[PDB]
Amino acid sequence: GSSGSSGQKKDTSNHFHVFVGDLSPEITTEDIKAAFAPFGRISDARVVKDMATGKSKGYGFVSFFNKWDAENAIQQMGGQWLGGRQIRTNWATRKPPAPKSTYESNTKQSGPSSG
């Protein structure tokens, strides 16, 4: 059959992670997995919980194997209702762009030598 395994790396590096918030107080990890299921194949997914009481933090995270899945969800899901309340979605992590670019030739040399 056609090769290519689903995910042979325990680390979530080649995946597209998505931030999720505004979740209801009962919304579990399975609620999120169900909600984002029709948008793509999920691997990592959880409901953030407070480290002092162990109760719902309000936010969660999801991670899709392909970009197109995550992109679709961020746009569409960001305004939909889950558990009877709205939710908020965006990219879990990003990187800022560079300011500007130019070119130069200042780094000249000669090196009158042989061997």
UniProtKB/TrEMBL annotation:
It is found in: Cytoplasm, Stress granule; Nucleus. It comes from the Eukaryota. Residues 16-94 form the RRM domain. Signal peptide: none annotated. Homooligomer; homooligomerization is induced by Zn(2+). Interacts with FASTK; the interactions leads to its phosphorylation. Interacts (via RRM1 and the C-terminal glutamine-rich (Q) sequence) with SNRPC/U1-C (via N-terminus); thereby facilitating spliceosomal U1 snRNP recruitment to 5' splice sites. This is Cytotoxic granule associated RNA binding protein TIA1. It comes from Mus musculus (Mouse). The gene is Tia1. The chain holds residues 89 to 190 of 377 of the full protein.
